Scaffold this active site. Sequence first.
Site, PDB file in Angstrom:
ATOM      1  N   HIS A   1       0.771  -1.231   0.000  1.00 41.80           N
ATOM      2  CA  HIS A   1       0.000   0.000   0.000  1.00 41.80           C
ATOM      3  C   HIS A   1       0.809   1.293   0.000  1.00 41.80           C
ATOM      4  O   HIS A   1       0.269   2.363   0.267  1.00 41.80           O
ATOM      5  CB  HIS A   1      -0.998  -0.014   1.156  1.00 41.80           C
ATOM      6  CG  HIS A   1      -1.962  -1.155   1.096  1.00 41.80           C
ATOM      7  ND1 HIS A   1      -3.164  -1.080   0.432  1.00 41.80           N
ATOM      8  CD2 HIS A   1      -1.892  -2.407   1.605  1.00 41.80           C
ATOM      9  CE1 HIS A   1      -3.797  -2.236   0.535  1.00 41.80           C
ATOM     10  NE2 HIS A   1      -3.047  -3.057   1.244  1.00 41.80           N
TER      11      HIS A   1
ATOM     12  N   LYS B   1      -5.552  -9.953  -6.775  1.00 42.60           N
ATOM     13  CA  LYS B   1      -6.218  -9.203  -5.711  1.00 42.60           C
ATOM     14  C   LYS B   1      -7.298  -8.332  -6.357  1.00 42.60           C
ATOM     15  O   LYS B   1      -7.026  -7.615  -7.311  1.00 42.60           O
ATOM     16  CB  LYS B   1      -5.199  -8.367  -4.931  1.00 42.60           C
ATOM     17  CG  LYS B   1      -5.749  -7.662  -3.698  1.00 42.60           C
ATOM     18  CD  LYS B   1      -4.714  -7.632  -2.585  1.00 42.60           C
ATOM     19  CE  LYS B   1      -4.863  -6.409  -1.668  1.00 42.60           C
ATOM     20  NZ  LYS B   1      -6.265  -6.137  -1.243  1.00 42.60           N
TER      21      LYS B   1
ATOM     22  N   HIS C   1      -2.366  -2.167   8.295  1.00 41.75           N
ATOM     23  CA  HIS C   1      -3.586  -2.531   7.598  1.00 41.75           C
ATOM     24  C   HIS C   1      -4.177  -1.292   6.962  1.00 41.75           C
ATOM     25  O   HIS C   1      -4.449  -0.316   7.654  1.00 41.75           O
ATOM     26  CB  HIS C   1      -4.598  -3.142   8.567  1.00 41.75           C
ATOM     27  CG  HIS C   1      -5.937  -3.420   7.953  1.00 41.75           C
ATOM     28  ND1 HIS C   1      -6.229  -4.597   7.297  1.00 41.75           N
ATOM     29  CD2 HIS C   1      -7.064  -2.670   7.898  1.00 41.75           C
ATOM     30  CE1 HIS C   1      -7.478  -4.563   6.869  1.00 41.75           C
ATOM     31  NE2 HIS C   1      -8.007  -3.405   7.220  1.00 41.75           N
TER      32      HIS C   1
END
Lengths: 120, 120
Positions: free
Chosen positions: B12, B39, B112
Amino acid sequence: DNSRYTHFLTQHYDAKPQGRDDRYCESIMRRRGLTSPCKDINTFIHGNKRSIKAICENKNGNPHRENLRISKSSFQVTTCKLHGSPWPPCQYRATAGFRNVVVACENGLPVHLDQSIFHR
Amino acid sequence: DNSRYTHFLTQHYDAKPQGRDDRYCESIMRRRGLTSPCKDINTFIHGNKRSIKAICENKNGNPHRENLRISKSSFQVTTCKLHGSPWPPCQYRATAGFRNVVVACENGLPVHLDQSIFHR
Ligand SMILES: [Cl-]
Ligand SMILES: [Cl-]
């Protein structure tokens, strides 16, 4: 002249909100006369105007697409979405959010909030 | 130990991106091995880690719901959404965005990113 901004404060600014529930929405829609007919989705920004106005300069916003500015900072916000008859009783549902907002400025003032980002 | 963050940079963060088109996405998904299986939606933040990490403190993020932090500042970003077979050729579509992001920090690090805000 400089009044579309006035209209814009009236539709999209509530400085200090007392809680942001559905009963909230229903109240402030009415007060701010957005009930005849019932506006289907409206969002209010909170905090101070200081910041909101500064979306209009490279101080707190860069341009965004065609005729539209986005803010660098995030705003506490509350989106009221009508449930059900475009006519009152007009009693919507409330969604509190926190994120940056998109507007059009004219003569350096916000004069349009863009609601598209609040369906999402 | 402190590696889920490492995994998080890898999934990310792309510091400086060279343009953000679909051909971009398809490239960086593969490089970053998110293609077996493909993904379905992944987002990369840009700029520096400095900022991203600071979502974990009251410096650049307040808490958000249950176990999740939101940033005060907005990030340039790029969301790749797969089109079509969860198996390569895996060639997604790209959406450039600018807005604040939501993550979970552990031991003070992002570990996350929360993708829900990017369907919208
Ligand atoms: Cl939000
Ligand atoms: Cl955006």
